[PDB]
Design a binder for this molecule. Structure first.
Ligand SMILES: Cc1ncc(C[n+]2csc(CCOP(=O)(O)OP(=O)(O)O)c2C)c(N)n1
Ligand SMILES: Cc1ncc(C[n+]2csc(CCOP(=O)(O)OP(=O)(O)O)c2C)c(N)n1
Ligand SMILES: Cc1ncc(C[n+]2csc(CCOP(=O)(O)OP(=O)(O)O)c2C)c(N)n1
Ligand SMILES: [Mg+2]
Ligand SMILES: [Mg+2]
Ligand SMILES: [Mg+2]
Lengths: 553, 550, 552
């Protein structure tokens, strides 16, 4: 027909977009109509929030922006949290929304608002197209800006008459966002010289160290040079089994981990793709001066606790390849060897169920271990936010890039199950596991109809506690009392069944391994009800370990 | 304790707030801690979206700002649509949110976000407090601005260190937002002269005509002067059983209603609390226009008032009422009223050729109306079911039919009914949605079960996003992205510990509804509906027919 | 019959007689269309001064001043102007070009997000994106600019929108409506609270200074015989008749007779008071008093401003309903002495010091000689600086809108362009403008406009060669000054280089003569007046409050 609506779909075609997540409405209608003619499969969502969470997951797993498409008013405003989360967690997303006609743009009329103004503080790019000719230009720049370091959200709004208008405007080439070269050579030399002269150099692998390419390079570096290392939560998957000896776990949330003590003992820290939002430098870069080398695709944020002595800004993996090429293996003096050894066995003992533990419910560590034993390396595991997620983020081993997905920017409740859906659409054929608590679960459980309608092979684990617990034990450590943390329990099994899904329940902690295998062998979506004992949770924020190791030294 | 958090709680005590809807988090948890000592009852929500909707319900039904309280980051950003909805539909709401400590406000850090900039476009008032001393001032101005005509949403954000900081700061008095006087008296006189000299003077009651005091005033005006009148959807309940004779239905959505032809035939139109968002003037609007409202009018190609009576709406109405006298109509205009009233009765009727194993929409509306007492509040969601409710479900009390008619936001029905039941203890509350919108906020059924709220939720079961579908069929002759698969509604209800009912055949409709009305605790009722008559809601038939009788 | 014509037609419907502007490419179609029909175009030398002029028209006529500019630097130069009007109750409408809609998101000459820039400093900031919407968007801009509280409205036109040919019809210029008075029972309440006061006082503020409000205020002050004070923008509330009940203009520093009056008051009635002129935390202090807020909009709650009664509605109507039903207050003995003492403190504070000697005029001598040289009805515009403090406290005004002060943003350089605006509003009358030397250069360029118009402006420069108001605050805080010194210029030959008339006061004794000589001159005249500023630190001095505190 050649409306503005067709120009939009043509862009999606040039961009190689396989799927569009959305919900139709009167203002964005022409575009949905034009998608009937061609373009990517439409995945109808049961909420624009979840549509955004789905696009985000696609962006994180593929490196090309996930696409979400919604109508005016509440269609658009329901995107806010989603885009915010994508934009602060390094995920390429492009959002396309409708608005009222240009003539009525300033009026009190149904579903009218300044779309671009709302999304301005929460995206890299937020625009509204006021001329049909401009559509291919605006859309193409949004894809590029979404993809360019640091990846985030782009939002593009269309008045209704703009996408309905007939025009002879030509499309433009989907010129892909270009790669940077590696960092300046002189900076790379300096960086190598500082690692070679260190008594205890260590690698801090961050958000953008967690991309597949970045991880491949990071592993060659760690293997050649033999550096100890830690991961941020979104760097999970850096580990391989033959790096386990050099691995000191995941830093974050509370300063009481072996990784923290290691970074403390370090005189040189090399950070890679490090976005401080995952764990503020004021928690780890303390207690003594210490050289900081910042390896990233964008310049560093200066902070009282973060003043890099060296910045290597360029393409992350290739910059790493250049350091790797000219570094050599680091020898550790006796003192540092013993520090490393001691940290390693504090790390080991942390991963164990307390010896005087007895219960009629599973311990969190038992859930974590059993889950890890029932799931092959290649399977993507998505995680929600809560105490369950602390246990997962610290103790759930991951061995491949993009196989453990955590929301460690906004810490947005409800991402797991929708993320699992997006993952299954990117990895057709594979099982996708999603893990949540019972609080965050109802934030997005509605999208179980999408999963069933798609016959997605998703396995969702609900940690059953019956409170907002991560908030509860923090309230106990601050005020020795809780507030607004309690809610009623629902029948998770019958909930799943009412959707046409499958419900299982761990009725005793010894059925855990069995019920898990069963979910994995099931056809279509499964929800698994797991009673958990959270009485150990308060110890997640303990200072015992920093204190013990303190008197060691 | 004299933290900033206590200063906040004290404002809520001073303001007479009985419920705060919320979800706790680290940056805001000091205010939640302070609520353990004194202050209103915390209602824990399963989604900040839904806490916002409930606060909207409280605001619409009491005139006092509803209060929602949330944490930083996604806690705040999840309020967006809620406050947008409230802000455009006339409901006083106060939102309170956390943010990161002042010193880290500029950094990439967990749950950080320029809160105030995000709500700037979608509220009357959006601010972040940067000094603990300023807390009582910023909160007290928020309540005032939320309530002041035209009522809307107010947003206040608090850095973590500001609510945790110990302080000597004094509270301020909750100075009530003041009412205006009536409109200028020479303006009132002018309007009385326009009505008394018109051939067919008519009243259009709008959004802010649906406040209880405005309705009581409007009824006296209608009865005394015997003017015909029409309702926007949010002015539902202006009608009294007494006034059914002068009543010409609800205007909205498509121009093809008896009310539309009436407004067209009128030489004078008195609009009361008319927010054009409910129905753009370019659809119903030569003739004289008298704009009566608590704020000045927006000028539009199709809306240029000859008279503006700006002041307190009920005051101004009374003044007009006091000095106006009965209008009597020439025979020409009586015939017009007779005909329009007749077209109106035909439209309210199930078509003659209708055959179906599912209920017609009108049969749901009729049985619902016949099963619910006039005083029972009925909330409604968004979709094809709501076109039917908005046009054909009669309301006779103020605030007993609640419709989202500024932002048309899916999912408002069930959370509104929860807010409503906390505002009217001892009463049943009815809510109506389609199956699409039901899953937008059905999570909150846990909350209704937790409170043992006497809610009866009716689900119109179709299996599609239909209101989108038949507009699509009319524009392109094909649908797109409107199909989803259905769930077992009864089992969905039972899994939450609520009661689930199902109308298995159209004749069971009366009894099943009755059963729901007498049930204990929350009830969900599955009601299959036949929508194949839905595309005629946008039909041009009636204006074409009436065109040639003239 | 383009979009540009639609814009000119709206200006005609609003009764706009003058448009202050500077042309550019993106907006020039509108400038074209103004050749055919419309209001006179006054070419400015800087978009800042065009904005100031507009503000002046708005303040003086009650209908929006109009300013028209091009895209990019044309529009951005408007920022301080609209901001100042938007915080001082002045209706202004601004019209600006932008790039074509197709190139709106591009890096291209003079492209910027116009609406976003003006959102935080206007009541109303919009961009039209369809030619049809022009009559609507503009009409609402005039009404919103006018609707109380009055201020700045900004409309932006992408270039292709005003050049586009259309058959769109215009829209009626529906006047912004009036409110009625406050509600009866509230009026009753206010009268009752006043009746039972031992010392009720009136505070006249910003919107108490419109002509109709002043007419009603004067009747109320006369009938009930209440003492009153003024905010700076409430100048001209006073009449010669009312000098007896008058306790001066409050503001800037809490050390004036008006402050002490307010402090002793048990009931304060405020009239159209915008706190920006003087924070309530400065006067509403040592003890409690009842506050009655009378205004066209609800009050801002403050730690030091929590009204017991709000009278919201049209200000002159509400004042009238109070005047009609109130009877005279009669002060007891204790309060009469109080009022008497304060009145003498007031009178002593207006006199040049005893041991004053100087080769240059003392400020009060400038204030005095200028007041006596100028008819009551003549409009006097004032700039910002130490000279303005002297003007604002001590220069009497007896007619509405004859003393204009920037008391919201305290914007430098407003005087001279405000006087240009005044003279266009009041043809055939002298207009006097007063500035310091520093603020003079902020807008002195616009003298070319005044000469080009043969405007009868008489501009007085207080010459001391420093940014003094900053400097003495710096000394009272830090015992040292910073960045307050600049060179000076020959004001007389400055004026002459523009084809204007330049006069100089070579000695304080020829002050009356050089002033009278300026009043009789044809065309613009600038006057160089050397001043001695050594007294200036005593403006922020703390003695009067202390001395009176011991007198109690
Ligand atoms: C959208 C949103 N609202 C509020 C919060 C604050 N918050 C963090 S954890 C949490 C509770 C999660 O509870 P649950 O999912 O049951 O996990 P659990 O701690 O019990 O394992 C809340 C409310 C948040 N992170 N996101
Ligand atoms: C939050 C939001 N998303 C999308 C829309 C667009 N929209 C309007 S009606 C509608 C259909 C709702 O369907 P349903 O609840 O099943 O009611 P039905 O039409 O079937 O009666 C949609 C998607 C909207 N109004 N609000
Ligand atoms: C645009 C602007 N810049 C700076 C200031 C701060 N300021 C206030 S008074 C003042 C000094 C003005 O001095 P001048 O005009 O020479 O008059 P004087 O103080 O000498 O009497 C300054 C710089 C201001 N108010 N406005
Ligand atoms: Mg839980
Ligand atoms: Mg449906
Ligand atoms: Mg000076």
């Amino acid at each position: 027909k050649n409306r503005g609506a067709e120009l939009v779909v043509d862009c999606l075609v040039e961009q190689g977009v396989t799927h569009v997540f959305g919900i139709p409405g009167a203002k964005i209608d022409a575009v949905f109509d034009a998608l009937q003619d061609k373009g990517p499969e439409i995945i109808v969502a049961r909420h624009e929030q979840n549509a955004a969470f789905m696009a985000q997951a696609v962006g994180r797993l593929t490196g090309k922006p996930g696409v979400v498409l919604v109508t005016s008013g509440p269609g658009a405003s329901n995107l806010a949290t989603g885009l915010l989360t994508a934009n602060t967690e390094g995920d390429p997303v492009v959002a396309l929304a409708g608005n009222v006609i240009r003539a009525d743009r300033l009026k009190r009329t149904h579903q009218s608002l300044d779309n671009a103004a709302l999304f301005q503080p929460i995206t890299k790019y937020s625009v509204e197209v006021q001329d049909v000719k401009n559509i291919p230009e605006a859309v193409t720049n949004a894809f590029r800006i979404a993809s360019a370091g640091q990846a985030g959200a782009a939002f593009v709004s269309f008045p209704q008459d703009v996408v309905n208008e007939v025009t002879n405007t030509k499309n433009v080439r989907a010129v892909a966002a270009p790669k940077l070269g590696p960092a300046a050579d002189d900076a790379i030399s300096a960086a190598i010289a500082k690692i070679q002269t260190a008594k205890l150099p260590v690698v801090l692998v961050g958000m953008k160290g967690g991309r597949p390419e970045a991880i491949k390079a990071v592993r060659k570096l760690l293997k050649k040079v033999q550096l100890p290392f830690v991961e941020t939560y979104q760097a999970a998957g850096t580990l391989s089994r033959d790096l386990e000896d050099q691995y000191f776990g995941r830093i974050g949330l509370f300063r009481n981990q072996p990784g923290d003590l290691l970074l403390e003992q370090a005189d040189v820290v090399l950070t890679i793709g490090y976005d401080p939002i995952e764990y503020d430098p004021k928690f780890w870069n303390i207690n003594g001066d210490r050289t900081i080398i910042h390896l990233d695709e964008i310049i560093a944020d200066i902070d009282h606790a973060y003043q890099p002595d060296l910045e290597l800004i360029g393409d992350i993996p290739s910059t790493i390849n250049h350091i790797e090429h000219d570094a050599v293996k680091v020898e550790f003096a006796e003192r540092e060897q013993k520090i490393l050894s001691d940290l390693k066995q504090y790390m080991h003992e942390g991963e164990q169920v307390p010896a005087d533990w007895k219960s009629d419910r599973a311990h969190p560590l038992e859930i974590v271990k059993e889950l890890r034993n029932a799931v092959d390396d290649h399977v993507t595991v998505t995680c929600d936010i809560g105490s369950h997620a602390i246990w997962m983020s610290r103790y759930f081993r991951s061995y491949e890039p993009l196989t453990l997905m955590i929301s460690n920017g906004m810490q947005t409740l409800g991402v797991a199950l929708p993320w699992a859906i997006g993952a299954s659409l990117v990895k057709p054929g594979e099982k996708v596991v999603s893990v949540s608590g019972d609080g965050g679960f109802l934030f997005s459980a509605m999208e179980l109809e999408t999963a069933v309608r798609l016959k997605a092979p998703i396995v969702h684990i609900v940690w059953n506690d019956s409170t907002y617990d991560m908030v509860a034990f923090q309230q106990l450590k601050k005020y020795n009392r809780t507030s607004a943390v309690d809610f009623g329990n629902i029948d998770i099994v019958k909930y799943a069944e009412s959707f046409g899904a499958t419900g299982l329940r761990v009725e005793s902690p010894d059925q855990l391994a069995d019920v898990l295998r069963q979910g994995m062998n099931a056809e279509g979506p499964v929800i698994i009800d797991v009673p958990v004992d959270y009485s150990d949770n308060i110890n997640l924020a303990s200072d015992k370990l920093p204190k013990e190791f303190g008197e060691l030294m």
